[PDB]
Design a protein around this ligand. Sequence first.
Ligand SMILES: O=C(Nc1ccccc1F)N1CCN(C(=O)c2ccco2)CC1
Length: 121
Amino acid sequence: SYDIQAWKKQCEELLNLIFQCEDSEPFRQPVDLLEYPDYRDIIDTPMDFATVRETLEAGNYESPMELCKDVRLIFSNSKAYTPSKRSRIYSMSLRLSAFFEEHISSVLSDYKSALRFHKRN
Ligand SMILES: O=C(Nc1ccccc1F)N1CCN(C(=O)c2ccco2)CC1
């Protein structure tokens, strides 16, 4: 299964599934500072799923590893901002992270295999 470009549509479909998840709603738009006034004192690099989708659609990811790094930043930001490990929004982040990781693993494996096959000679 050695298509070097296949990851892009696979990531578009996975983002569609993430947008259908109720657990993604807090992460679909850049955080609002008017509600959470201390946010940029704690978080150096904001990230959200709409920014990920736009970056993919603009053709500004070269690999699914780069997309995976930005999605993992959404989750590390939520862990860095939570006052409690028993927070509603952090709790939604942990379920959504488990879902993401379960689905991205084959995308990454297939891409890396395709690359290796391209370099085989
Ligand atoms: O406001 C947020 N998102 C949001 C944006 C627009 C419309 C509606 C929304 F919900 N947030 C709150 C801050 N975040 C946290 O990860 C967190 C962990 C513990 C408490 O917050 C990120 C998501």
